[PDB]
């Protein structure tokens, strides 16, 4: 084992000559890059350890385990502002990749920075990424109890994914809380938009039947059978 600093200085030269030799022959082999970048973290020289990950990103910046390991290397040494810059370059280079967005979130979740995940989610849901992002963004506000904020999301979420399983998710939100004045307002908005946008042909016959039935069976539980009954006539006439 290493005794003094001069034996350490000769130990570090032998490994760094070795690893830089295999990376000179193989620019590729991302696993070889990380094992030499992990070596420099063990030597407690983070200036070198940042450099190998930066050099490895110049070879293959689309390799996701390389991004996560360099982010985790900045987090394990408590360099939080080095990680914020790094995850910012992660999501600005590869905005499609879901892992890089969830990595930004659960670190700022871990720091209880609720205004930074909210600013992050507003940007991420502006690029129209998919239903996994929005559903984790409506689950974020339920944690924060922001009931007025999560109602603003479903206003935008039905405009990004116009389909009944996003509209019926919003009425499963409102009927979970029992607010009757808010639920039929969503129900009135959902059935008018099918009528307003009839010519676009984006809701199928089986798909509009889920909206009419879930409207009617809710009105049956609200003891107003005459509204349950009349909407069946307008829907059959509106769609014969």
């Amino acid at each position: 084992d290493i005794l003094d600093l001069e034996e350490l200085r000769e130990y570090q030269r032998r490994k760094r000559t070795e690893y830089e030799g295999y990376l000179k022959r193989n620019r590729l082999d991302m696993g070889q890059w990380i094992r030499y970048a992990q070596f420099e973290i063990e030597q407690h020289d983070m200036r070198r350890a940042r450099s190998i990950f930066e050099r490895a990103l110049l070879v293959d910046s689309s390799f996701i385990p390389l991004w996560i390991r360099y982010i985790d290397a900045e987090l394990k040494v408590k360099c939080i502002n080095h990680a914020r810059n790094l995850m910012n370059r992660a999501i600005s280079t590869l905005p499609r990749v879901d892992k890089l967005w969830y990595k930004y979130l659960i670190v700022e979740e871990s720091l209880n920075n609720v205004e930074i995940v909210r600013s992050l989610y507003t940007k991420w849901c502006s690029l129209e990424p998919g239903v996994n992002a929005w559903n984790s963004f409506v689950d974020f506000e339920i944690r924060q109890k922001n009931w007025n904020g999560v109602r603003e999301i479903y206003s935008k979420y039905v405009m990004a994914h116009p389909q009944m399983q996003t509209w019926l998710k919003w009425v499963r939100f409102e009927n979970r809380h029992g607010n009757t004045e808010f639920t039929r307002s969503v129900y009135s908005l959902a059935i008018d938009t099918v009528a307003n946008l009839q010519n676009l042909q984006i809701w199928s016959d089986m798909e509009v039947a889920k909206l009419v039935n879930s409207f009617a069976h809710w009105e049956a539980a609200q003891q107003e059978y005459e509204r349950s009954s009349a909407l069946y006539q307008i829907a059959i006439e509106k769609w014969p």
């Binding site: 979130l105 659960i106 979740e109």
Partner: protein
């Protein structure tokens, strides 16, 4: 059946870390800013010294658990199979790969 795509597995591992973060807040309950520079465009965020240690220790501990789970999986992988003749560990490792293909 199928494998899990990298969008779902990112979501599921996101939810597991939220549940684990929720129980850390539950256990911390039971046991008891942004300033932008004028000179530069650089931005400064006030943080507690806790929850940065707690994130770093958690990332280290998860790395320990996954390392030892794979290490124990290494132990089982070289102690289970002994039927086919081999030459080294890498032979049995490659012929486990051919058994996985069947």
């Amino acid at each position: 059946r199928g494998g899990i795509s990298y969008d779902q597995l990112a979501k599921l591992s996101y939810e597991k870390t939220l549940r684990n973060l929720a129980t850390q807040t539950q256990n911390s309950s039971k046991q008891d800013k942004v300033q932008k520079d004028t000179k530069t465009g650089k931005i400064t965020i006030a943080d507690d010294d806790k929850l940065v240690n707690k994130l770093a220790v958690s990332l280290q501990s998860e790395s320990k658990k996954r390392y030892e789970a794979r290490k124990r999986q290494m132990q089982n992988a070289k102690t289970l199979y002994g039927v086919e003749s081999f030459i080294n560990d890498k032979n049995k490792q490659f012929n486990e790969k051919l058994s996985r293909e069947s």
